[PDB]
């Protein structure tokens, strides 16, 4: 009955340029059990057309998923990933930083 908290990376598929269409990724990994809530946020609001990979797992049996959507970086829009999991007291929000 083991519980492992998710690692989160938020990043773009391609190097980000403002005004140039791209893909926003939220990679969640290292967690157990598999039930998890992942949303991509634009200026604090949930993005609607988000897809995800087929659940798989690593050598320690911890799960991973990639959530992704099309987006266009801009100077003023703030993007983020919001994750909730039984191991988390409150939802965790990780802002997208194009340098990481």
């Amino acid at each position: 009955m083991i519980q492992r908290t998710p690692k989160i990376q938020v990043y773009s598929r391609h190097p980000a340029e403002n005004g140039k269409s791209n893909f926003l990724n939220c990679y969640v990994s290292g967690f157990h059990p598999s039930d998890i809530e992942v949303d991509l946020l634009k200026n604090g609001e949930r993005i609607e057309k988000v897809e995800h990979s087929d659940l798989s797992f690593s050598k320690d049996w911890s799960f991973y998923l990639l959530y992704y959507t099309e987006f266009t970086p801009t100077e003023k829009d703030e993007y983020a990933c919001r994750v909730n999991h039984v191991t988390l007291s409150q939802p965790k929000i990780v802002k997208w930083d194009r340098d990481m």
Binding site: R13, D35, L55, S56
Partner: protein, 276 residues
């Protein structure tokens, strides 16, 4: 070519409030997903996920669909058995995970095979490297091991892992050679991010590479540097390739002492990167 692997991953999650377990199966050649099954999806078929597998005929897809549904029912039965073995209530959700597959070497001959099972995220039972014996993690699994040693289970798995698995892996490598036998060397570059008026982060990027295995290491004046470094987990780009970066904080003006070193199967000689 190089060395190669075929692996199947299975997860079943019980849903005590209503219905059958959620079941998800994925198949990989090396780091390429090529088939999937999801119990919640509409088709109820094994589905292709790579262009080179779509050329397989209807007998292939009917057969894989039958077998993957049989896998799901085995996991369903197992979830019920394990609840009794561990004396757990019917009210909680529990998980079973299974992975099996084969590796071949550069000559495309059998190198090793594996078959591993977990319950609630912990080792339960695994086939040993000899493909003859079982590792049981606890006494519940010891019960399963005694059952499987009496029923010739390891023999059947060894025959699949050394025969069928390797033979179909070679077939996939041929049919998908355009991508499966191509290595994508990392596209590398270095970025610079001040953290004060006199220190800065140097970040060494590896982008768009395949397969996923890679090593990024920082050196200072020709010696390995782990102090003040950060290495993120390799992550999927979403287009079948992978990404990674490593970073070091340095005093501003001293960037030339630091070199990032990149090792990857697609690189005949490792790359060395230095900030402008």
């Amino acid at each position: 070519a190089g060395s190669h692997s075929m692996r199947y991953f299975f997860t079943s999650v019980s849903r005590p409030g209503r219905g059958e377990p959620r079941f998800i199966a994925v198949g990989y050649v090396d780091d390429t997903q090529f088939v999937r099954f999801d119990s919640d999806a509409a088709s109820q078929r094994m589905e292709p996920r790579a262009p080179w597998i779509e050329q397989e005929g209807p007998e292939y897809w009917d057969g894989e669909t039958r077998k993957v549904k049989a896998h799901s029912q085995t996991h369903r039965v197992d979830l019920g058995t394990l609840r009794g073995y561990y004396n757990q209530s019917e009210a909680g959700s529990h998980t079973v995970q299974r992975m099996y597959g084969c590796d071949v070497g550069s000559d495309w001959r059998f190198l090793r095979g594996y078959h591993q099972y977990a319950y609630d995220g912990k080792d339960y039972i695994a086939l040993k490297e000899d493909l003859r014996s079982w590792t049981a993690a606890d006494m519940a699994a010891q019960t399963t091991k005694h059952k499987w040693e009496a029923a010739h289970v390891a023999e059947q798995l060894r025959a699949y892992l050394e025969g069928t698995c390797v033979e179909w892996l070679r077939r996939y490598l041929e049919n998908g050679k355009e991508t499966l036998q191509r290595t994508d060397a990392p596209k590398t570059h270095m970025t610079h991010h001040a953290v004060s008026d006199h220190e800065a982060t140097l970040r060494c990027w590896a982008l768009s590479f395949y397969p996923a295995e890679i090593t990024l290491t920082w050196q200072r004046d020709g010696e390995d540097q782990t102090q003040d470094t950060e290495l993120v987990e390799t992550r999927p780009a979403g287009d079948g390739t992978f990404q990674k970066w490593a970073a070091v904080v340095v005093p501003s003006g001293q960037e030339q002492r630091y070199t990032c070193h990149v090792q990857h199967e697609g690189l005949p000689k490792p790359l060395t990167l230095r900030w402008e």
